[PDB]
Amino acid sequence: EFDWQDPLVLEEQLTTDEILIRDTFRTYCQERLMPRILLANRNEVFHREIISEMGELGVLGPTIKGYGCAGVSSVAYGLLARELERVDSGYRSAMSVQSSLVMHPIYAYGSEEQRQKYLPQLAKGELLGCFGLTEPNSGSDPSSMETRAHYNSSNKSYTLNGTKTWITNSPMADLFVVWARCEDGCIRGFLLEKGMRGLSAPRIQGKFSLRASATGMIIMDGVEVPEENVLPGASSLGGPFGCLNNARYGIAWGVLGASEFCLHTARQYALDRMQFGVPLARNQLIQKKLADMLTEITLGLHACLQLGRLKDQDKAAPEMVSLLKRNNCGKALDIARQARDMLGGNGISDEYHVIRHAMNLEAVNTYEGTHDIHALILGRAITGIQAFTA
Amino acid sequence: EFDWQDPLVLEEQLTTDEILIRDTFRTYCQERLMPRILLANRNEVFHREIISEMGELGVLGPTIKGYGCAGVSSVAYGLLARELERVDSGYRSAMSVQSSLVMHPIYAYGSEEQRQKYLPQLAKGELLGCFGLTEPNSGSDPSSMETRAHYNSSNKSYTLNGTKTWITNSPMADLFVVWARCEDGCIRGFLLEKGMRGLSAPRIQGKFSLRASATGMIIMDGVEVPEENVLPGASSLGGPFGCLNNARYGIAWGVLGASEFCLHTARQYALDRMQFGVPLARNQLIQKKLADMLTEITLGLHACLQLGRLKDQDKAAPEMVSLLKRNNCGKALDIARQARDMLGGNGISDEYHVIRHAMNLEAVNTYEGTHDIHALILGRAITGIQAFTA
Amino acid sequence: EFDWQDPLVLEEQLTTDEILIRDTFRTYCQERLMPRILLANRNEVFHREIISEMGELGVLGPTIKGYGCAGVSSVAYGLLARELERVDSGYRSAMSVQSSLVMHPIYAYGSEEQRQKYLPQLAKGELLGCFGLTEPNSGSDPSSMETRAHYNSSNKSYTLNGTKTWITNSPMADLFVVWARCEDGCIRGFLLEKGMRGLSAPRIQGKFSLRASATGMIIMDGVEVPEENVLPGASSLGGPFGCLNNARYGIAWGVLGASEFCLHTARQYALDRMQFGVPLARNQLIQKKLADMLTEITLGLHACLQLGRLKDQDKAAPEMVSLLKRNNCGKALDIARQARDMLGGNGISDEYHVIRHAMNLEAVNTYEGTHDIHALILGRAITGIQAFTA
Amino acid sequence: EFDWQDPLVLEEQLTTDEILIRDTFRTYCQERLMPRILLANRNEVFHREIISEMGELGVLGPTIKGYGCAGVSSVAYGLLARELERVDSGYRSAMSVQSSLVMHPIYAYGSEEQRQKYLPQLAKGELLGCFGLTEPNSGSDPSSMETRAHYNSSNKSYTLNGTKTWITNSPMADLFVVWARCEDGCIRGFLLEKGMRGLSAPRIQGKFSLRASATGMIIMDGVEVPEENVLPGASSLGGPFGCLNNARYGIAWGVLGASEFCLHTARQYALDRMQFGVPLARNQLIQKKLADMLTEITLGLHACLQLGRLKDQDKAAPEMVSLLKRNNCGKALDIARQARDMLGGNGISDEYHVIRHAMNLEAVNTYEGTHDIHALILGRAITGIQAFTA
Ligand SMILES: CC(C)(COP(=O)(O)OP(=O)(O)OC[C@H]1O[C@@H](n2cnc3c(N)ncnc32)[C@H](O)[C@@H]1OP(=O)(O)O)[C@@H](O)C(=O)NCCC(=O)NCCSC(=O)CCC[N+](=O)[O-]
Ligand SMILES: CC(C)(COP(=O)(O)OP(=O)(O)OC[C@H]1O[C@@H](n2cnc3c(N)ncnc32)[C@H](O)[C@@H]1OP(=O)(O)O)[C@@H](O)C(=O)NCCC(=O)NCCSC(=O)CCC[N+](=O)[O-]
Ligand SMILES: CC(C)(COP(=O)(O)OP(=O)(O)OC[C@H]1O[C@@H](n2cnc3c(N)ncnc32)[C@H](O)[C@@H]1OP(=O)(O)O)[C@@H](O)C(=O)NCCC(=O)NCCSC(=O)CCC[N+](=O)[O-]
Ligand SMILES: CC(C)(COP(=O)(O)OP(=O)(O)OC[C@H]1O[C@@H](n2cnc3c(N)ncnc32)[C@H](O)[C@@H]1OP(=O)(O)O)[C@@H](O)C(=O)NCCC(=O)NCCSC(=O)CCC[N+](=O)[O-]
Numbered sequence A, B, C, D: 001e002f003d004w005q006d007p008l009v010l011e012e013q014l015t016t017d018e019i020l021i022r023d024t025f026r027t028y029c030q031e032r033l034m035p036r037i038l039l040a041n042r043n044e045v046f047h048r049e050i051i052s053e054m055g056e057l058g059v060l061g062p063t064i065k066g067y068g069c070a071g072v073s074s075v076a077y078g079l080l081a082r083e084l085e086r087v088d089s090g091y092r093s094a095m096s097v098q099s100s101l102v103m104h105p106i107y108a109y110g111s112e113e114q115r116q117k118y119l120p121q122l123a124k125g126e127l128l129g130c131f132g133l134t135e136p137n138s139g140s141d142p143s144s145m146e147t148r149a150h151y152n153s154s155n156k157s158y159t160l161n162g163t164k165t166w167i168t169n170s171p172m173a174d175l176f177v178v179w180a181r182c183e184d185g186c187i188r189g190f191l192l193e194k195g196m197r198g199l200s201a202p203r204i205q206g207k208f209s210l211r212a213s214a215t216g217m218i219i220m221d222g223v224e225v226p227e228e229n230v231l232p233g234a235s236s237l238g239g240p241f242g243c244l245n246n247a248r249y250g251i252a253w254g255v256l257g258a259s260e261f262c263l264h265t266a267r268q269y270a271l272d273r274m275q276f277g278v279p280l281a282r283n284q285l286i287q288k289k290l291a292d293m294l295t296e297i298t299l300g301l302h303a304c305l306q307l308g309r310l311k312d313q314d315k316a317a318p319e320m321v322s323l324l325k326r327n328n329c330g331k332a333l334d335i336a337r338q339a340r341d342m343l344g345g346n347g348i349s350d351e352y353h354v355i356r357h358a359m360n361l362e363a364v365n366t367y368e369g370t371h372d373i374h375a376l377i378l379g380r381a382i383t384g385i386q387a388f389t390a
């Protein structure tokens, strides 16, 4: 009565809606996404259509209530990210930015006018957006950003100068959610659109992780922003971090799908591949590995479920997310890597996919807070003493 | 709004009864058990009273319905083991044998006569019992036991010959649940009592783990057992394993209490102890450690909860228990060990307790299935191929 | 008086010749190889010239005495592989095959005629060769190969049928050292040349490790081999394994150069990059990592030296090589991976190289005996009991 | 031709003297020490005779030239510590204090008068001494000690006040090498003798590591020290650290003997013990473990040799010692722990010794610089930036 595909019976913890949503999406991901990943990753191609397609299904910004959004549960959102990442982290990355980094901030910190004007377009996937926070000299430390936004009392607008790097979707984005430090000292959010004079977003080259994802910079040379494009609700790092926490939540779920794909591929390979007469799955060394993968995946899955439920209850704290994001991203990496080692020579061929996952999880464990930064965060909470600086 | 003592809010997942039971027991453990552990461990003393005391509280065999038993939930049983182990694994070990290895088998595989005759005595703690399975040459492999039970068609009884070693409570036990191989090939359970001619149970010496626990052998020299003392419900290893699974379930919870005590002690020490001017808790190396402990403890806690709920639903499978028992016992060990290292020189003094926990968890990770054996078990389930033998 | 670039003063353990050779080669590798690796790896381009160039320097098959070979020490050979791998594993791979897998077997198991005919050409780099052992269904287990060589009593020749896969250099090789099972049961070595009817060697596609290296198959459709092309000295797996051991020896050294490059890059990045005001190198978490890298590299370096000396003394045993190859390849991987994590977002850009090393070491830890296979080898030696099969 | 007891042939790297010394000592350790360890550890008994016995053999302070000392090599000193620790760390601890913490400082920083007066007595083992540096509030940070030594211009002497804790041998010592901070700010060394009014050294209780070793405090209540008892050569922490480095060197070797004993015991147990029909040594999981132990031991052994040679050449730097001490002590621990797990239930019985080693290595990895402190030391050297404080 034991099912290795669901050791602790996650299923009976999901509502019928949640289960329906997952199954529906999984179908799309396997029929439409999986078949285009081999070459999209191999040649760094990002199909812009993927956003329109997901736009149709109504998967973009699923937790938002209204404005053409499904208004589903945090758990469902997690289940979605898991099915997406089960195909490729690059894809899930685009869906994470669109949902938790663009739509969410506009929704939570924007004016109704902005909401009405953008939320529907984003939800349908007619507007590919991006989140501009990181800068060449500001990553783990955002209070060090150099992008300044000056106010023009006369024209009722701000002039932005700065450079954002390592930005997902920037190269082919229509809307840019940028954060700059103001003359008053506060850091606000600005909405920029392709075409604004002074705005350019070149592609980054030489990526060997999340290749099926578009990544570039956001260069602002005296870009002038109207006042109605200023996110009226965020006055400090609390705004971007609020968004970051919703993204990290989805990433915690996501990577588990990636891990699951590795476990399944490794397991099958162990059964089909044979050496020394019997199938690889007959050796003790191979089996212990499969055991460790399943073990870690399971602990992560049920922990994620809990957080999702606590979230919908407005009981989830930032630390809680740091805890699962840090854990799951790290563990996922080891699983991918063990999987790679288990396929032997074949393991280094994208034809077998594991290598693609191992490489993607490399970037995943880095962005949205590095593995160690999330530890200092937990540590500050545990001791009440900060240890980021000296 | 983040509480490091309950990251994912386990509390709101417990029923009022469960919470009451835990709090009630915790009080007993902290007022009556903690104050007698330093010297009991230091001098290998086991207070037989502890069983009578626990007998009063009605903690012995708590999941049993009737016969003077509380008839509580699997979760409550887990919460109890956790509070006990939070003091010492030796104590929890006695309570695990009494509840899941003696009372449970009598209850599940015994005759009403046996139930009526023993269950109440055991529940009140008037009878200290033990489980005799392991033998000098049979541990991970029980189908290799040498204890034979011959049938006496005439006297309607069996004569038992064999030796059981590493048995918890045997030295001061009144009832012995022994398993021997029969002439028909099946392995049944026999109930023995102190005083039976031919039965001796000497203490084992030189233990440096679970010292506050009594451990010895069960030597049977032609011990004659009446027919009414044969567990009529167990005809093969399914009987002992059935019991083993209920014990392992409690152990999965248990070790988490032990880990929690280590985390708390380490955390405090980090705050109170100071070097280089500031408190140890200010250093990055110290904080990351605290983070890792809390992380692992949390994943284990919520996984255990789930299993407990699935168990009460008669939906828990042996593999599920192997998964959490293996995980939690291993992780608990690392936590104890990190804790020890964090207290520095003081860490090797029982006066600071961590060293006692590190040593206890050593035996815990070994009995009731070694860390690796539980992996081969998971592996057999995952691949459908056995890898214990060649 | 402590030098982190040589903790235990390896230098004073090298003879003047050895040191000269290393320095000479290092110059070539840094001036000629490093500048062509970024794009060669990025676009899977292998410069055939690299072999001719190395041919000039006389680095090809350096331990061979005569036939236009330098006839240097095993240590010098190790020092060479280390400088090469310090640039890229792909390059070192080509030099390992040429030297220990092609030239060595011809030298040790060939006829003078063969030696005279090939050794000089190979040494000058006029003949790019390859070693064909692995097959689609035979990797860790070579006694399972399906490539058969039938004897033609009449024409005094053998007809070979089979497929070798994952072969380094095969796509642009001139000489092929192939091993097939014979009708007598023994497995011998055959020398094949491009152009032989029935012989094809297509490129393998989709590699995400050792990309600057050419890899393909060796397909033999009734390829007819003259008798004078049969390696007269190898009659069983002892031949290929003899060669394998010389290759593995160089790989043990090699990966250390790769690790060293990662340590240096990480260290510098830690000093130049700044967050939270100070340089990354100021944080405890960063420093411990640097410590662990240096520690492992050092142990490996001095162990390799010893083996090299024992080798030149004809005192080196296969197990000794398994021990260092397994160790160094595994440790190297962790170092590369930590390095990658330390550069943050930048770490996933080939522009920073670490990602290239992390990916290369993935294949390195797999070929020439997987990490676990080398463990079973050590284990057989330690216990005297084989554990490869059931 | 492969010998698992000496994978890389350490033997042929030792001079005839060194080998003779090792073999001679090993005989003493196995015939005189091993037979008294079971109960000495079990009952915390320290045989003072052990020092006299070692005094006879001339093993005390073996590197010292003159004053009744063997004047042997650093390597020989290492070989000695290894044979001693192969029996028990407690014993090696007494020999480390006597040699590198008492005799060495007197020799290097003392006056001829002091040398003449003590060195011979210590060498013969007529004077059991101890090193008093650590204090209740000063461990990893010695520049925080509170033991002050006031000068009495009149009586030409100093009055010492302070408390040293966790001191090896203090309870039954005759000579005390104590370090206190002076009114001039410098920290010097003082020689104290049992009987000095105001001096007491009570035993520490509740140790569960290094039990066969005597450990206590050094309480100084206005103890008056003559001027001729002041170590005239040490004026700051450079004195104690100089000594510390010689002790740490021996500890690096030492723990390897402890590891070796564990490997041998585990290996044998794997061959003799049988489950599931065959010997434990037949399982893949068991073999990989044995492989990892041997691997780590070997790397450590040859690294230690090198350092020893560099030391005798006056080319060894503090960092070099931190590197091997940190490495070997940590690795040794894992080996002991794996060994313990491999003996199963038996593993927790001192009757099988491994448990004793696992527990001893716990304290060893802590004193003479914790595992992490040695990392910050290496890190300071690698980056040139200190990270101990904020
Ligand atoms: C801020 C830190 C750097 C540390 O410096 P500190 O000085 O200690 O700042 P503090 O954190 O102490 O204070 C700053 C204010 O921020 C608030 N805060 C902190 N954490 C959170 C969370 N999780 N959610 C909401 N708000 C939060 C805090 O309460 C303060 O608020 P107010 O009172 O409202 O003013 C760190 O805590 C942190 O969170 N950042 C680390 C790096 C990071 O956040 N990088 C983001 C990367 S974006 C990305 O990767 C896009 C990828 C998407 N994709 O999937 O492709
Ligand atoms: C049996 C094994 C050794 C492996 O050999 P295998 O040949 O593969 O046996 P199989 O397992 O294939 O078959 C034997 C039968 O047993 C059944 N089985 C297996 N696992 C379970 C669980 N968890 N629960 C109930 N029944 C179980 C199985 O279905 C078969 O049943 P029937 O059809 O009914 O006849 C292994 O699976 C195992 O479970 N044992 C490992 C060692 C062990 O169990 N030791 C127990 C120690 S007791 C102890 O530590 C007391 C400490 C208490 N304390 O807290 O102090
Ligand atoms: C043979 C094994 C698979 C295990 O099966 P077993 O049944 O136990 O075989 P056995 O090993 O017991 O017996 C076979 C005979 O082989 C001999 N042997 C074993 N090891 C060695 C070494 N190291 N050197 C020389 N000879 C050796 C052995 O003494 C026997 O000899 P004779 O008496 O002379 O007849 C294993 O031991 C092994 O060595 N192979 C594992 C996989 C492997 O070797 N793959 C090679 C890959 S090639 C490659 O990766 C090219 C990459 C180059 N590059 O850098 O790009
Ligand atoms: C000093 C530290 C705490 C860090 O603080 P810092 O502010 O950075 O001090 P600094 O280290 O920067 O400066 C202090 C001076 O000390 C010198 N130093 C440092 N390391 C060494 C070594 N290895 N050998 C000789 N001299 C050394 C340094 O060059 C300075 O010298 P001068 O110019 O001559 O004046 C740390 O570096 C350290 O070494 N100590 C860590 C803890 C420790 O040393 N504990 C000792 C325990 S004793 C024991 O365990 C007995 C057990 C025996 N047994 O086997 O049973």
Ligand SMILES: Cc1cc2nc3c(=O)[nH]c(=O)nc-3n(C[C@H](O)[C@H](O)[C@H](O)COP(=O)(O)OP(=O)(O)OC[C@H]3O[C@@H](n4cnc5c(N)ncnc54)[C@H](O)[C@@H]3O)c2cc1C
Pocket: A097, A130, A131, A132, A133, A134, A138, A139, A140, A141, A165, A166, A167, A168, A169, A209, A210, A215, A363, A366, A367, A368, A369, A370, A371, A372, A373, A387, A388, A389, C273, C275, C276, C280, C283, C284, C285, C286, C341, C342, C343, C344, C345, C346, C348
């Ligand atoms: C594929 C990809 C897509 C990305 N997409 C986006 C996007 O859409 N939007 C956006 O805003 N950003 C994005 N980023 C960047 C990401 O958010 C930043 O990488 C991350 O916040 C910070 O790291 P960093 O690159 O600046 O490196 P750093 O912050 O410089 O860190 C480098 C290393 O140093 C460590 N470190 C830093 N500070 C400390 C400390 N105090 N103590 C101990 N260790 C420390 C880190 O843990 C890490 O190991 C992306 C990155 C990748 C790789």
Ligand SMILES: Cc1cc2nc3c(=O)[nH]c(=O)nc-3n(C[C@H](O)[C@H](O)[C@H](O)COP(=O)(O)OP(=O)(O)OC[C@H]3O[C@@H](n4cnc5c(N)ncnc54)[C@H](O)[C@@H]3O)c2cc1C
Pocket: B097, B130, B131, B132, B133, B134, B138, B139, B140, B141, B165, B166, B167, B168, B169, B209, B210, B215, B363, B366, B367, B368, B369, B370, B371, B372, B373, B387, B388, B389, D273, D275, D276, D280, D283, D284, D285, D286, D341, D342, D343, D344, D345, D346, D348
């Ligand atoms: C304090 C304490 C109390 C105990 N109390 C009881 C009690 O009350 N009742 C009872 O019946 N028993 C009891 N036991 C014993 C316990 O159940 C047995 O230790 C356990 O089932 C088996 O291990 P073993 O000691 O026989 O060692 P082994 O089974 O011999 O195993 C030794 C080592 O070998 C490994 N191993 C074994 N087989 C394999 C394989 N096929 N593949 C790979 N590795 C393998 C193990 O994982 C372990 O690392 C107790 C033990 C301790 C230490």
Ligand SMILES: Cc1cc2nc3c(=O)[nH]c(=O)nc-3n(C[C@H](O)[C@H](O)[C@H](O)COP(=O)(O)OP(=O)(O)OC[C@H]3O[C@@H](n4cnc5c(N)ncnc54)[C@H](O)[C@@H]3O)c2cc1C
Pocket: A273, A275, A276, A280, A283, A284, A285, A286, A341, A342, A343, A344, A345, A346, A348, C097, C130, C131, C132, C133, C134, C138, C139, C140, C141, C165, C166, C167, C168, C169, C209, C210, C215, C363, C366, C367, C368, C369, C370, C371, C372, C373, C387, C388, C389
């Ligand atoms: C870039 C690259 C270049 C290569 N170049 C060459 C070349 O020039 N010449 C040549 O002959 N070959 C070459 N190879 C192939 C290499 O030698 C084979 O990959 C290796 O010997 C065996 O692995 P495999 O791919 O067959 O996988 P497998 O042997 O099938 O192994 C797969 C996984 O199963 C494990 N496994 C296998 N058997 C056991 C067991 N009994 N117990 C426990 N675990 C087991 C392995 O450890 C591994 O994790 C190359 C491979 C790569 C990736």
Ligand SMILES: Cc1cc2nc3c(=O)[nH]c(=O)nc-3n(C[C@H](O)[C@H](O)[C@H](O)COP(=O)(O)OP(=O)(O)OC[C@H]3O[C@@H](n4cnc5c(N)ncnc54)[C@H](O)[C@@H]3O)c2cc1C
Pocket: B273, B275, B276, B280, B283, B284, B285, B286, B341, B342, B343, B344, B345, B346, B348, D097, D130, D131, D132, D133, D134, D138, D139, D140, D141, D165, D166, D167, D168, D169, D209, D210, D215, D363, D366, D367, D368, D369, D370, D371, D372, D373, D387, D388, D389
């Ligand atoms: C059996 C035994 C015998 C001993 N014998 C002697 C003897 O003969 N003579 C003598 O002088 N001393 C002796 N000592 C004590 C030993 O030298 C001290 O334990 C050691 O120098 C320091 O640790 P501590 O106990 O003070 O703990 P702490 O220094 O307080 O450290 C506690 C924990 O905090 C960590 N820590 C401390 N500072 C930092 C930091 N800045 N950053 C990150 N982590 C940090 C440590 O690594 C450790 O994990 C003995 C100890 C034992 C256990």
